[PDB]
Each structure stands twice: as C-alpha cells, then as structure tokens.
Write a protein that binds this ligand. Structure first.
Ligand SMILES: *[C@@H]1O[C@H](CO[C@@H]2O[C@@H](C)[C@@H](O)[C@@H](O)[C@@H]2O)[C@@H](O[C@@H]2O[C@H](CO)[C@@H](O[C@@H]3O[C@H](CO)[C@@H](O)[C@H](O)[C@@H]3O)[C@H](O)[C@H]2NC(C)=O)[C@H](O)[C@H]1NC(C)=O
Ligand SMILES: C[C@H](N[C@H](C(=O)O)[C@@H]1CCCN1C(=O)[C@@H](N)Cc1ccccc1)C(=O)N1CCC[C@H]1C(=O)O
Ligand SMILES: *[C@@H]1O[C@H](CO)[C@@H](O)[C@H](O)[C@H]1NC(C)=O
Ligand SMILES: *[C@@H]1O[C@H](CO)[C@@H](O)[C@H](O)[C@H]1NC(C)=O
Ligand SMILES: [Cl-]
Ligand SMILES: [Zn+2]
Length: 604
C-alpha cells in the first residue's frame, strides 16, 4: 500500500477516534476511485487485460481495508461500542469490519479472481443455434415479443443452461470464501452481514408480515394472467390450477410481466398505454431517453447530469463489437466529479423506466457528494433503489405521457384506470414475489441450509412457492438457474428491490401530498413540483448519515416500511381482479404444484 495511503497514529479514546475517522475518509476516497475506474474500464471493455487490472485494484482496496481496519481494532475494539457519538459508532464500526480483507493474500486473490470470472461468464454467455444470441438485446427481445411457445422455450432453456451451468463450481467456492471472510468479522455468515445494513432486529419477520399483506394481490394478478395465457397457448401448455411455465411472462426471470400487457389488457378500445411503438414511430434514441429523464429531475429543481456524465457514460451497446456488461448500472467514482451510467439502452417504454431508475442513483450521488465517503450511501439500500422508480411512477401516468408527446388521447374514466393499474401491477405486483425470494435463496446458501447439492432444488422450491411458476423443461442439480440472474454471479444483494417496490409507493404518496395533489394516488404526476423536489432533496442530501427509520419518518411521517400506500395505489384494480377471478370461477393459487408443461412435439 502506497505510503500516502497508510494510517498514522491517533489516541486510543473517543477524541482520537474522531481524528482517526476524519483521516480514514480522506484516504479512502482515492482507493475507491482507482477501484471503480478499473471496474469501469473492464465492464465497458471486457478483456483479460482489463480483468487483471481490476483484480489488482481490488487487491489494493483489500490492503487499504486491512491497514485501516487493523488500526481501528488496535485502538478501539474494546471501546467503540460505548462511544458517545452514534455516527462515529458507524463511520468507524464499519472500519472494524474487514470483509474479504480478512482473508490471507492467497484467498484474497482467489476471491477476486472468482468475482471476475463469474462476472465474465454471465456477461459473455451466448446461446448458439452457428450464429449466437446475447442476452441483451437478442434473448431479451425474444422473451419480450415472441409468442411462440417453442422459441421462448429455446431462448429460456438456452440462457439458463449457458449462464448457469458453468457458474455453479465458482459460486460454491465464492460462497465458502465469502463466509470465511465475514465470519472473522463476527457474523454467522455473509447473509447475516448483508441483513445488518437494515439495522432492524426483526427484519425477516417484518418482511414476512409485509409479504402477507401483498400476497393476495399477487395471487389475483397471477390467476387472471394465467387465464389470459390459457386462452392463447391452450390447455396443453397452461394448467389453470398449476404454476405458469416460467418462460411465458415476457421476461427471462418472469420478474416483470409488462411485456405481456397486450394479452391481458381489459379495455383495448382505450388509449394504448404501452408507448413503445410510438417511441419507435417518432425516432427516439437512447440519448433522448436520458435527456427526457434528466428534464424530469430538473423540473423538480434537482441537479442536471454534469458534463462528465454525458462525456463518460456508455448509453448504447458499442457497435465496435467490443464485449461489455450490458446490465444497466449507475456509477459513482468517489472523486465528486465523475458519475456515469452504463446501459445498453433499447428504445422501449420499460427501458425508459430503467433509465429513470439508473438516473435516480446518479441523482443521489450528486446530492450527497460533499459528505464523508462512508456516508455516501442510501439511508438503506432500498432507498437508493426507490429514487428513480418514484419519478417513473409520475412519468408513466397517461397525463404525463401526453405531456411528453407519447399519448395523443387522454381519458379519465374507470376503464382507462383499470388498464393503467393493470399495466402497473404487471410491472410492480408481479415483481414482489421475485424480489422477496432471491435473497431467501441466497440467505439459505450462505447459512449452509442450501448446500451445492440443493442449489437448484431450493431455487425452484422458492420460485414455485412465491411466484407460482415452473420451469418449462426438466431441471436437475447440474443446472444452476439462480446463476442465470445477473445479481447472483455479480454478488449484488436483492432484498433492497423488494424493499424498494414497497417504499416507492410510500415516497410517491408523500411527494404527491407535498405537491398539493388531491386526486387518486395513481393519477398523481409530481412533474414541476419544486415543493416535492425539496422534500426529495432533503432525503438525498442525508446519504447514510442518519438512521433510515428517522429519514423515512421525516419524509413520509412513519418510521417503518408499510404496504398501505401500495395497497391504496392499487385498490381499484385489486377489487376488479378479485371480482373478475370470482366471476370466471378461477382457482387462486397453484394447487397442482407438481405440474410441468410437456415439451413441444419437435423440441428443439
Ligand atoms: C380524473 O377524475 C377524478 C374523479 O373526478 C371526480 O369524479 C368524476 C366522476 C367527476 O365527478 C369529476 O368532476 C370529479 O371531480 C379526479 O379526482 C378528483 O379530483 C378532485 C380535484 O382535482 C378531488 O377533489 C378534492 O378533494 C379534496 C378532499 O379530498 C378537497 O380538499 C378539494 O376540494 C378537492 O376538490 C376529488 O376528490 C377527486 N376524486 C377522487 C376520485 O379522488 C381526478 O383529479 C381526475 N384526474 C385527472 C388525471 O384528470
Ligand atoms: C436494472 C437494475 N440494475 C442495477 C441497479 O441499478 O440497481 C445495477 C446492477 C446491480 C446494482 N446496480 C447498480 O447500478 C448499483 N451501482 C446501484 C447501487 C448499489 C449500491 C449503492 C448505490 C447504488 C436492476 O438490476 N434492477 C432494477 C429494479 C429490478 C432490478 C432487476 O432488473 O433485477
Ligand atoms: C479495450 O481494452 C484494451 C486493453 O485491454 C485497450 O488496448 C483498448 O483500447 C480498449 N478498447 C476500447 C475501445 O476502449
Ligand atoms: C440433467 O439434465 C440434462 C439435460 O436434460 C442431462 O444431460 C443430465 O444428465 C441430467 N442429469 C444430471 C445428473 O445432470
Ligand atoms: Cl440489500
Ligand atoms: Zn438500482
């Protein structure tokens, strides 16, 4: 570690801890920079040479984290927990937490190489027919707009096999090294470490109580969609009393169902709320999408994207054939100057949502950039995930789409509302089970409840239990279907997205009230509300400097996650779906839990 980056001396008491903490933050900033820069260079240009520089940068970060962590342990291990300053308890008590820096060098190298090879496998996997389809855009477009059972099967099976199978051995090794590292910081396993970010001793119980209030909405949406699929694919491929085949829902993970909107839309005579075809008709490109997102943020008197954002970002899949990580992501370089998005943007309405989602992360980074590095975080991870989604709730309203030239006719009647809420439920309610289940899987794996010999059996257990989907071809433990989802090989926690999906409705409700809006919550558009903007800005400017419970309470008036705002937003279509399911004699749920569809006669 460079001499300039190493800790000096400080006194073994609270006032010393203060000086410790201040010089700690001041050095970390340069180490963060080199690390994220090496990641950028690799993720926008996947090469063996870039992966090596990235691994070298991560080793440097670990050496830094070891030297400062050990120092914090030498001075303060027996005394930081009774420190009078709460913030210091934690700008600090993080530092006593070495993570992978607890591993000896050989294992640090092995860990860092695993992350890099897992990322590379996921991002370079292809499905071969021999010309080859990538996840983004090729397989994505197939899952989105093909209606051919056999083609969807080909893409689903191809992807799961290509990404998942080679990841499995690496993932097992990763898991063991991760646990070994976090266990030396006093956690029972890595998932306990991940859960501790919520600083909530009843987190798991609280989540389960949330899920119980939301599950009926999901069950009704599921039965109605299942019937709409049955009408198209027939009695052989759809069981009205069984799980839905996992490839027929418009998305590789069945996690968002908005792409099958045209098959379930109750009132097709009303304005078509999927504006993708109008975006194409009009010549929208990636850069327009980012500009339109940006202008929503400035209408609230939040910050525009800086020059360095426009110069540095990767907003389209490169055409020079270069290999890139296509999964959309938002980047803070920790130098208070460079922030970027890397997205292989496609011109679709759900991509416009993703753009807002990503830009929400940038906005948070811009607002908190002057805080100590350790406090440059969301109040909890779910907060970072909710910012852009909140704005996207206003964006997607018919009234707002009309304002931006994407919906000619505006209607305000109960059928239009059902079509709108149904579309929003396909995006938001369908996701809830998947949001909750992914980290349940990973928590069981890190705790050892799910050994490698049950990785796929426990995955599909949870997939069926919560989502009520089934794999469209037989799977076995050679398959590693969880590794076919980005966040698993990329080692990014998932529960934040479940938290986000609930909290965004609480924020939306608060910002709508602050904007002086007085009609149904699902019609609210906070566009141009500088009062809504100021309230959002107070949250963004806080970073992680105060407990999330108190940031939440200031913003929305309650200090907990609460399903009530989402229920209230959805209440008209909740009641309509229950009435429709009842009139159609649907069975809620999937009591034929063992059913799987047959293979097509000529498969593949
Ligand atoms: C779409 O339409 C709804 C419904 O509008 C109401 O019902 C229709 C059938 C017609 O009778 C309309 O003339 C009628 O307004 C609109 O929602 C309604 O907005 C008004 C004001 O914009 C709300 O009234 C407010 O109520 C608060 C107390 O809650 C009072 O402080 C105020 O005096 C204020 O007038 C009204 O409650 C609200 N109705 C519902 C269903 O909540 C909606 O605004 C309109 N939206 C769009 C996008 O055009
Ligand atoms: C497309 C969206 N992409 C992610 C994302 O932006 O979250 C990317 C990839 C994983 C995290 N991520 C980032 O960019 C992070 N830099 C965000 C962040 C993490 C910690 C602290 C601050 C900021 C996503 O996966 N999503 C979106 C909602 C559903 C979920 C999915 O597609 O599975
Ligand atoms: C990609 O990385 C290599 C080194 O791995 C570098 O020589 C090359 O210029 C990069 N290409 C682009 C277009 O960034
Ligand atoms: C798992 O499934 C594949 C494809 O159907 C098959 O090749 C394999 O032998 C199966 N069994 C095991 C133990 O992998
Ligand atoms: Cl998280
Ligand atoms: Zn995000």
């Amino acid at each position: 570690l460079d001499p300039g980056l190493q800790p000096g001396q400080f006194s073994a008491d609270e006032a010393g801890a203060q000086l410790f903490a201040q010089s700690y933050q001041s050095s970390a900033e340069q180490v963060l920079f080199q690390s994220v820069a090496a990641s950028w260079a690799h993720d926008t240009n996947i090469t063996a040479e870039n992966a090596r520089r990235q691994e070298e940068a991560a080793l440097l970060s670990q050496e830094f984290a070891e030297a400062w962590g050990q120092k914090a342990k030498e001075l303060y291990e027996p005394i930081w927990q009774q420190f009078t300053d709460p913030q210091l308890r934690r700008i600090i008590g993080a530092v006593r937490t070495l993570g992978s820096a607890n591993l000896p060098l050989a294992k640090r190298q092995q860990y860092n190489a695993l992350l890099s090879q897992m990322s590379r496998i996921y991002s370079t996997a292809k499905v071969c027919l021999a010309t080859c389809w990538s996840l983004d855009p090729d397989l994505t477009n197939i899952l989105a707009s093909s209606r051919s059972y056999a083609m969807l099967l080909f893409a689903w099976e191809g992807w799961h096999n290509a990404a998942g199978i080679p990841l499995k051995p690496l993932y097992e090794d990763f898991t063991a090294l991760s646990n070994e590292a976090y266990k030396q910081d006093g956690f029972t396993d890595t998932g306990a470490y991940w859960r501790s970010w919520y600083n909530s001793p009843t987190f798991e119980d609280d989540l389960e109580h949330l899920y119980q209030q939301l599950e009926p909405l999901y069950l009704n949406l599921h039965a109605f969609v299942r019937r709409a699929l049955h009408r198209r694919y027939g009695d052989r491929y759809i069981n009205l009393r069984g799980p839905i085949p996992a490839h027929l829902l418009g998305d590789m993970w069945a996690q968002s169902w908005e792409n099958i909107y045209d098959m379930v839309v109750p009132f097709p005579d009303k304005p078509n709320l999927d504006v993708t075809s109008t975006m194409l008709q009009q010549g929208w490109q990636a850069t327009h999408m980012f500009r339109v997102a940006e202008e929503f943020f400035t209408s609230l008197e939040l910050s525009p994207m800086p020059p360095e954002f426009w110069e540095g970002s990767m907003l389209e899949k490169p055409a020079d054939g270069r290999e890139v990580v296509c999964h959309a992501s938002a980047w803070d370089f920790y130098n208070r100057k460079d922030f970027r998005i890397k997205q292989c943007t496609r011109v679709t309405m759900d991509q416009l949502s993703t753009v807002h989602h990503e830009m929400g992360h940038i906005q948070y980074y811009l607002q908190y950039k002057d805080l100590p590095v350790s406090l440059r975080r969301g109040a909890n991870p779910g907060f970072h995930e909710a910012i852009g989604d909140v704005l996207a709730l206003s964006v997607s309203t018919p009234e707002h789409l009309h304002k931006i030239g994407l919906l000619d006719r505006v209607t305000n009647d109960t059928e239009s509302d059902i079509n709108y809420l149904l579309k929003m439920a396909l995006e938001k309610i369908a996701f809830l089970p998947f949001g909750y289940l992914v980290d349940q899987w990973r928590w069981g794996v890190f705790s050892g409840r799910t050994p490698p010999s049950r990785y796929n059996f426990d995955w599909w257990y949870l997939r069926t239990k919560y989502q009520g989907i089934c794999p469209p071809v037989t799977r076995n433990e050679t398959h590693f279907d969880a590794g076919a989802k980005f966040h698993v090989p990329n080692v990014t926690p998932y529960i934040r997205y479940f938290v986000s999906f609930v909290l965004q409705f609480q924020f939306h409700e608060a910002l709508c009230k602050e904007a002086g809006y007085e009609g149904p919550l699902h019609q609210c558009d906070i566009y141009r509300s500088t009062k809504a903007g100021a309230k959002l800005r107070k949250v963004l400017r806080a970073g992680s400097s105060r407990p999330w419970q108190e940031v939440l309470k200031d913003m929305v008036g309650l200090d907990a996650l609460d399903a009530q705002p989402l229920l209230k937003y959805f209440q008209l279509v909740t009641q309509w779906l229950q009435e429709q399911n009842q009139q159609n004699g649907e069975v809620l749920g999937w009591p034929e839990y063992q059913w799987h569809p047959p293979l097509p006669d000529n498969y593949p």
